[PDB]
Amino acid sequence: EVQLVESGGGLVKSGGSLKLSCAASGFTFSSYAMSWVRQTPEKRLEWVATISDGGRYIYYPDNVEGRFTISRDNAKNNLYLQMSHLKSEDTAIYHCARDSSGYLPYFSYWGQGT
Amino acid sequence: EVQLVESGGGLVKSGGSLKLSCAASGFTFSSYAMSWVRQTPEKRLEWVATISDGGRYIYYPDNVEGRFTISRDNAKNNLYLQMSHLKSEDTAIYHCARDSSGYLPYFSYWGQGT
Amino acid sequence: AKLETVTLGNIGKDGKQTLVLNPRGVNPTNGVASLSQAGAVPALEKRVTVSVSQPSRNRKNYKVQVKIQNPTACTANGSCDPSVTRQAYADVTFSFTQYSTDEERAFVRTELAALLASPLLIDAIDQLNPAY
Amino acid sequence: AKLETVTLGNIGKDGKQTLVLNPRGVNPTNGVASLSQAGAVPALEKRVTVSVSQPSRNRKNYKVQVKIQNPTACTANGSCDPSVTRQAYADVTFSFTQYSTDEERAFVRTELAALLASPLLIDAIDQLNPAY
Amino acid sequence: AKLETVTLGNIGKDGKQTLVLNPRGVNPTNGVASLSQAGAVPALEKRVTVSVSQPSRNRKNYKVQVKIQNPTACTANGSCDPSVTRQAYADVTFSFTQYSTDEERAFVRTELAALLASPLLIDAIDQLNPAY
Amino acid sequence: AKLETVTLGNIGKDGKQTLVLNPRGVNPTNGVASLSQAGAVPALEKRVTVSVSQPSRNRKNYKVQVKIQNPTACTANGSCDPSVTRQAYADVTFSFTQYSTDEERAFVRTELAALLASPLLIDAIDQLNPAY
Amino acid sequence: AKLETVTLGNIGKDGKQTLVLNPRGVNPTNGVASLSQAGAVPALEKRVTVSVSQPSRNRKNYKVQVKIQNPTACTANGSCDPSVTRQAYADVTFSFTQYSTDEERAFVRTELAALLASPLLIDAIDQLNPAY
Amino acid sequence: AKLETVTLGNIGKDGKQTLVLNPRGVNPTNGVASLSQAGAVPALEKRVTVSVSQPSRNRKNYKVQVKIQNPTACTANGSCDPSVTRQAYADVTFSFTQYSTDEERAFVRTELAALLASPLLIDAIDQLNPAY
């Protein structure tokens, strides 16, 4: 059972920072690529970031790239998103997702939280 | 010699009911699909009903479906048609027929009666 | 029964194909009855054979046996009449004893005909996947 | 496919019974999937086995094989657990080469499924009469 | 000729019972052709066989043989299957030479039938009284 | 069924530790299925094996066997590799007949589990006290 | 410790049944301690035994053994006493060295219990499915 | 891991080609897992197989093994369906011991994947030139 729960959450002001986390049990965490996908209050999905198996190849979109940062901990099986500068569009749900066994991700398993 | 004789017959009023029967000797009755085909006094043929080998799959046309009912008795080798509600178009000959070894029937053997 | 033309409907993946099989006599030397398709060349015909063997001093069982043979043919480079490229076979054997009732035999027949339309077997036969 | 439970409805001569089947795993020696009846005791349940065999250096074509057996339980006197009196068997084997297509294999499967409901095979299998 | 379903009527001590016989193939090793009654549990069927010498060119003696056997059923207490207490047999052999005509053979057959309908032999067989 | 990653929770004397087991295939020669813990240096892994008798038709005794072994690591001074000082074993065998039902087997399994949670046996095993 | 009446709760496939075991002394010849269920006709009792190695000074291997047997009753027709058709067995052996700690033994015991509550083993034992 | 569809990108000399590989089950009799392409005819499929073997009484090594098979097919003069003309193979064997850490294994894997994209090996494999 692929399980993904999130922490951090938050209610911040503008220009602040926060660190979202993800716990990721049920499977061999260090093999798979992981990803963040947020959902706006007007119910639109947006890709946020992806990372590789060992944390080497990291992808961001242009709306995100200067001020978000993701990382892994393959010993604690944790996924991390470092949010910063928070310019008031960042008011979404921020799901975790496991990427497909592939080249570029299609999310198969999802985590509800935050 | 595939033999098929009918009973019941009848002279009814409108809105009544009757039960036609069929005796079916000469062949292994329980293997074949059986059918009813009536012939109007203006000499037009009309399919009435079909049944399967064991009595599971029963077909009717739209002019018939709510008020006729057919059944088999594979121990007594009898075929039954339960006519009901008799709305004055039902003044025909009502032949028995053995279906072809097929999917949808073409009648090969016919029974004269009623 | 008596050999007449068997016409089978709802065949294929879509279930919109039919096939007619015309009687080709019973072979007296083994008791095998034959149905075939309607071609002129005998090597291109899809055929069905069916037999049933009584108990003897050796087997002590009733043995029903059905075989299906479908050739696929194509004409090659520099060839005029089509030759048979492939053969798809099927071979069903039913085995019963002297004290079996007819309802048991009908149960086995309908059980096989219902297994052949279940997603396990239509995935094992069509796409060639062992059940895993 | 996945070994799940299989419900076989519209089964039997009247066509009103069901046979529910629970997966019993595969066999690491043979490679054969197994399925048994819901309820049971062992040695008194209805069994379905299925294998798929790939080409090798010995046989060049694929081979799918289904094998169903079912017993009859008779309660003798002086004993509390039933014995088996009769077994009924059926085993289909399909043979397909490596250049065969999905349409041909589905045609064989659905042809056999449609053919076992035809009056020739009714009267051959559950009445044991040959064709004439 | 070719075997078909033989329906025999007005049988028994009263003359009301019927007997429907279905064909069950030709034994290739001796040419004996079988007919049997559509009854469940095939060990308990009325069985009739007929055997004619095959027409050669230098055969001196044509020989016809008819055999009837009817079993009785006994559901013995303490079992699930009926068994056979009794059989009733009949064995008729006709012997002709190669210069015999159709009317001589027909006279012998209709004579035997008219004797079996005669009160000498529905007293020697039905009541077991020797003629004296 | 098919092996998957088994996560066991609330283990130990306190009831907090976990154990995540990944599948490691079936031995084809005897059918034993392995599970092992994701730990570096594969000589130092928590290992669990499970072995069930394969369902035949004439098997009299079904037999289940579970084995646990947990090693301990000792980085001996004067070497680069940890070695195994100790193993801790566990060997559970269930034995059933072919007429046993599901509820009898389930009662035996849940009884053994409820005994291992009982203060008689978390005193005979944890503290090594014989019952007297 | 000292034996007492062990009441085990929530047993079975549903998780409702109980089992009350009363102590039945220590065998002096091997140290095996017995528990049995308060049921009439003492040949038909749920029986549990536990055996621990006695603590010496130079013992290298501590060994715990638990045995469960549950019989079934069959009032055979034509007798006054119930007999035993079936037994259901369980045999658990723990093996430890003299340098093992309390937490290692407790981890092995709670691991075996958590496996017996896991769907891998209430499918291998309850339904007799080998893991593959 | 668990077999799901593997999609590989940046393949070819240009690096602008993809390939999807769908799971085709694990073979229980050797432990070989299979991925194949999405055709109907099984002889035209590009396939990948992967296994990993535990140490035994003979080898004493963990052995990972990957195989790649790519057929190339074309239809000939006077032929209708395409036949397989050529086969391009690949066969990688990894070998490790019981005391190897996971970082060593990951180093060997990434070292191979980095050698396969270096001008020495892409000149030795593409243009078939020994390193001189």
UniProtKB/Swiss-Prot annotation, chains C, D, E, F, G, H:
Result for mutant: residue 33 to S: In strain: Qbeta_3_FR
Transmembrane segments: none
Subcellular location: Virion
Domain of life: Viruses
Note: This protein is translated as a fusion protein by episodic readthrough of the termination codon at the end of the capsid protein.
Functional summary from the UniProt entry: Minor capsid protein.
Protein name: Minor capsid protein A1
Source species taxonomy: Viruses, Riboviria, Orthornavirae, Lenarviricota, Leviviricetes
Included range, full protein: 2 to 133 of 329
